[PDB]
C-alpha cells in the first residue's frame, strides 16, 4: 500500500506521549533501548517511613538538555555525556533557576532518598537531506569504572544496549532506563555516606557514528532535545530543604 | 579369602575441621566422656531458662541517658541529640586511659555483627508528678551528616517523622525509631579493631522542648528524664564479624612496643602554665621551665588522613597538677618551630579540639580557643612525675 | 565393645581437587560462611539479568569498520576486504608500543576457545538519504590464501556465494557469512601466547561497488558505511584454551630481561636522515652523525622461519623527530656490512615491510621502497633522547 495523498494537511500519522499534563509528539516511531528488567519496589525493604511517589507531578516530561549537531563534529565526539538522575536537577539549577521552582523536582528537595525507573526521549529535527548518525547509550554506573574513557567510544557502546539515530528521516531514540544501582535507593543530597556522587544512577551519552554529510551549501546546523519522564518512583525520607544540595557542575 | 582388587577410593587431605562452621552439620571429634552417646540432659530443676536469641537480648530495655528537664528551658531548646543506632554510648567517669562505656543489650549486639537494618525504639521514662505539665518532641531525621547535625532547630525536625508528647498524669512514653536508609542493612559505626573501616550512623533522633514545663510551687521545677534503648519490633542482625567491644574483666593494655608517647628527651618534668605566644597567656600549655620560652617540645604524631589524635596519660598519679590532674592533652605544632602539649579538661574536650585542628583549622580560631584550659586552672602548678607515659588515641573525623 | 577386625579400606593419595573441572560434580571445600547450607539467593530486586551464554554474547552486534562510500568510486572498486572470522580487528590509534584493538562480543569469544565452526553475519548500516542510490556486493569466497587475497576483482567474487544490495529508501542490510571449510571446527587465527601455533582464517568477504552512487546536488556525495559483526544463526564454540586477548586495565609489559632492543654501543643519539647508499638518498634511515657513512648500526635479530620482525619504541617522548615521532622502524642488513634502522610511518607500514623482506625479497624492489619514508619527512631532524628502548615485535608470514 503506497498511495500518497497529502491534502491541505500534508498527510502522515503523529504518535503522542501524554502521559501526565504534558503531550510530546513524534512523527516517526522511536528506536527503543531496554537495558534491564523493570525494577521492583524496594521501599518495603530499606526504609519504613512515608512510602510513596508523586504521580501527575514527577511523572511528567521536563527538558534537561538540548544541543547542536554540525558537519564540524568529527567521527566520535559526544554531544552530551549527561548523568541521568541528576541532570534533571543539574540543568535547571545552572539555568540560574532553583530546584524548588519546578514541579518535577520538588520532592527531591524535601525527600532524602529516591528510587525509580526512568524514561527518556532523544528527539531531533533533522532534514531529509542530511546524512548523519548518532547513538544514545546507557551505562548503569559510569563514574564507578576507572578506565571508562576506554569505553567512552562509539565502538564500545555499540557493543551494548543503545539506540540509533540517523540524520535523514529524523527520528527519535526511546530509552527506557529502569533502576539498577548497587544499593536499591539513591540519596538526594549529602548523607552519612555518599558524601559525593550525590544522586547518580549512571550517565547517558550521545556520540556520533556519522557526521552530518551535507551537500554544497546544504543546511549546516542541526539540533537535539532531551526529555525525561520519572515514572514508577518512590521518595521515602522526609527532610527539611535546608539539608538540600544544589548539584555539582557539568 | 577373596581379593578386593578393584581400584581403591580417591581422597583429598585436609588437616582440620572446622573453625567455621556450626549451623547444621555433624562434627566428629574425640570426646573425653566415657560414652559414645554422651550428651548432657537438662533436668526439671536444671531448667533451660533462656531462650538464647539475638532477638531475646535486643528486647530488654537498658538505660542509656538521663536528661534534667527544667522550667527554665526555653520554648526553643533541645534536651538530647543522641544517635539513632544500636551503637549509642554512655561514658562512665574515670579513670585509666581507655574510658569504659555503658551499652544496652541492643548495644552489645550487634557489636558482634557487621550490619543490622533494624527498627528501634526509645522508652522516655519521665519521672513527674501530676502537677508537672509539658510537651516533648522526638524526630528521626535521616541524612544527618557531620556539620548538618547542628543547624538544627525543633522546627525543621517537625519536617521529618516526629512525635509530640503531652504529660499530665501520664509519665513515660515509647517512641519507635524508624529506619530510613538507601542501604538494606547498616554497617558498624564502631569498627574494631580498625580505624578507617567504620561508617557513621544512618541518622539520629532529638528530644526538644515543644512546650516548657509549668510547675506549681509545691513540686520542684527540675525533673529527670531517664532514657532507655532496645531493639524495636524488627531490629535485624546480619553477619558475625570481629566484636567492637571488649571485656570489662581486665581493662589493661600492654603498651607496644614500647611506643609510649612522651615528651622529647630533656623536657621533663613539666607543669601546666601559660605562654604569651599561646593565646596571649590566656590558656594552659605544658612548660618545662619558668623562664623565657621554655615550652615542652613534643614528638610529631604521624596520623593518616581521615583520623585525629590526642593524649591520655597512663597513671593519673603522675600527671601534672593544677586544679585537677591534666590527664588529657592535644598535640599540635606551635609555629615557633615545634609542637606543644596543650592540656584539656577531659577526653571529650581533647577530641573536640582534634576535631577542629585536624578538621583543617588554626589555633587562633574561637572554636578551638574555647577548648583551651583557662589560666586560673594552673593551680599550685605541681610538676609531673618526670616524663610519664601518654598513649596516642585515634578516631575518624 | 565389638572389634571391626575385617580388612580396612584401600585408598590412593592425591593432594588437591580440582583446577579442572566444574561442569557437573560436587566440590567439597571449607566454606567460610556460618552455615553448611549457605548458598546465596537472588531476590526479586537482585534479579539475575543474564543469561550468561556463549551464545548470549555472540549475538550482540558490535561495530568493527567504517567505510566512506563516494560517487567518485568507480564501477570497478572495493570498499573493504575484511576477514570472515570472529578474530576480526579494528586498530585504535596510539600510543604506547603494543597497540590496542577493538573486538566485537563475537570477538572476545572465541578468544578463549580453540575452535569455532560457526556461521556469522555482518550488518552493513548504510547511512543514506532516499536521494542516494547504489549497489554493493558481498561474497564469502573460501580458500583465500596470502597472495591470492589480491588478484581479486568484483567479478570473480560473483563466482562464489555473493549478494547485491539495492538502496533507495532502505538504508541497511544484513549478510549472513557462510562457513566453508574442510575442517569441522576452526582453530584460532590469533594464538596466544605462541607465534607459530596460529592458523590463518578460513576465508574472507569483500564489499565491492557493483554500481557507483548517484547523488543529487542537495545531498552530499560521500557517505559513511558503518559495519557491525556478530555470530550468526549457528556460531559454535569448541574448546577453552589460553585467551588470545589481554586486559585493558594495565596495558604495561615489564621488558625482560633486560633484552630491550636498542642501537649498538656508540650509535647514539640518532636522527632520521638520508643516505646515498639507501635508495639514493630518497628515503629516511637512522644516522648517528652528519658525516660520511655514519649510519646507525643495529644488532642482528634472530627470527625463526615463519616469522617477521620490526620495532616500536617504548616512549614516544624519546623517539627521533621529523614531521612526526618515528616510533616504528624495521631492521635489515645494509650490504655495506651492517644492519640499518629504517623508520616507518606507522606499525602497519613496518609490518608490511617485514612481510616483504622476510618474504624473501630485497631492498631495491619497488614494493619495499614504497614503504620507506620520503626524505621530505626528515623535518627539523631532532636527535633522539640518547638510545631509547625499542621492543622487537613478532608475527607469522
Ligand atoms: O574406585 C572405585 C571403584 C568402584 N566404584 C564403584 O562404582 C560405584 C559408582 O561410584 P559412585 O560412588 O556413584 C560405587 O558405588 C562403587 O560400587 C567406585 O565408586 N570407586
Ligand atoms: O576391605 C574390605 C572388607 C570388606 N568389604 C565388604 O565387601 C563388600 C563388597 O565390596 P565392594 O564395595 O562392592 C563391601 O560392601 C563390604 O561389605 C570391602 O568392600 N572391603
Coordinates of N, CA and C and ligand atoms in Angstrom, one line a residue, chain B residues 4, chain C residues 4 6-9, ligand 2:
Chain B
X4 N 39.7 -58.0 47.1 CA 39.1 -56.8 46.6 C 40.1 -56.0 45.8
Chain C
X4 N 35.8 -54.4 64.9 CA 35.7 -54.4 63.5 C 37.1 -54.8 63.0
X6 N 37.8 -56.9 60.3 CA 37.8 -57.1 58.8 C 38.7 -56.1 58.2
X7 N 39.4 -56.5 57.1 CA 40.4 -55.6 56.4 C 39.8 -54.2 56.1
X8 N 40.5 -53.2 56.5 CA 40.3 -51.8 56.3 C 40.3 -51.5 54.8
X9 N 39.8 -50.3 54.4 CA 39.6 -49.9 53.0 C 41.0 -49.5 52.4
Ligands
LIG2 O1 38.2 -54.2 52.8 C1 37.1 -54.6 52.7 C2 36.4 -55.5 53.6 C3 35.1 -55.8 53.3 N1 34.4 -55.3 52.2 C4 33.0 -55.7 52.1 O2 32.8 -56.3 50.8 C5 31.7 -55.6 50.1 C6 31.9 -55.6 48.6 O3 32.9 -54.7 48.3 P1 32.5 -53.5 47.2 O4 32.5 -52.2 47.9 O5 31.4 -54.0 46.4 C7 31.5 -54.3 50.8 O6 30.3 -53.7 50.7 C8 32.0 -54.5 52.2 O7 30.8 -55.0 53.0 C9 35.0 -54.3 51.4 O8 34.5 -53.8 50.4 N2 36.3 -54.1 51.7

